[PDB]
């Protein structure tokens, strides 16, 4: 019951141990292990932190089954400040991790909902170049 | 001139490419760093789970219209 | 300058777009001339 593993190299250059079936729900480490045959796993555009958090993703889900709601342990996994939720989105979806890239991507969409144009701007410190003009005339569909 | 394929880089993201099937593996990665910024010693590219060697061809690897290659990143 | 979703790959800045509802999206293009374009894009399809 206990499966072998294999090793990921963050950009800064730490290497992690990693579960096979674990890290294989990336896609990307899944192909670049099996056919290029690469052990570690270079990974040039994720550095150790945004790493760590992926792997501990990944474990949590380990046994997942297969609605649209978040579990409340991916809520809680994703109270991080904006940078890495952003960075978290890029190396989901570099690595081809579907269900985090979309738990992510629907956490930033939950930041837009339910909101003023302006509170959206504070939220994401939006720059405004609309004139008076343009923000009557999006005021149309 | 005048052959089209995909270059898969993420669960989402692609990068569209126009070629020719005497085009190089090196001319490939070439216009993936035109459009992206991604110098082609970074860049692995694979078409049915096989490394393409940047020497040989899109007709060697028998890679046609609308075929998807995968680009995958190496340190420099 | 730029923003959270102005700095994203397109496909992905539209894919995070593409979970709100048109009312959310029609308040979202309100935002910027760019995040306009994003999500009336998202608005087909709808």
């Given at each position: ?127 405004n170049?609309f004139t008076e003009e343009e923000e009557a005339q999006?005021?149309?569909? | ?76 | ?46």
């Open positions: 019951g206990a499966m072998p593993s294999i090793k990921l190299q963050s950009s800064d250059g730490e290497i992690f141990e990693v579960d096979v079936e674990i890290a294989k729900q990336s896609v990307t480490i899944k192909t670049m292990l099996e056919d290029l045959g690469m052990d570690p796993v270079p990974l040039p555009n994720v550095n150790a932190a945004i790493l760590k958090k992926v792997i501990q993703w990944c474990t949590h889900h380990k046994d997942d089954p297969g609605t649209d709601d978040i579990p409340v342990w991916d809520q809680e996994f994703l109270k991080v400040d904006q940078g890495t939720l952003f960075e978290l989105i890029l190396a989901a979806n570099y690595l081809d991790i579907k269900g985090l890239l979309d738990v992510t991507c629907k956490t930033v969409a939950n930041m837009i909902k339910g909101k003023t144009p302006e509170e959206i701007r504070k939220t994401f410190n939006i720059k170049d999006v005021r149309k569909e | 001139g005048s052959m089209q394929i995909f270059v898969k880089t993420g669960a989402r993201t692609a990068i569209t490419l126009e070629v020719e099937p005497s085009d190089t593996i090196e001319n490939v990665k070439a216009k993936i760093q035109d459009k992206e910024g991604i110098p082609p010693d970074q860049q692995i590219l694979i078409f049915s789970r096989k490394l393409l060697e940047d020497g040989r061809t899109l007709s060697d690897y028998n890679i046609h219209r609308e075929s998807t290659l995968r680009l995958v990143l190496i340190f420099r | 300058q730029r923003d959270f979703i102005s700095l994203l790959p397109k496909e992905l800045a539209l894919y995070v777009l593409s979970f709100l509802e048109p009312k959310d999206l029609l308040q979202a293009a309100q935002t910027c001339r760019y995040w306009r374009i994003l999500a009336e894009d998202n608005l087909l399809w709808r």
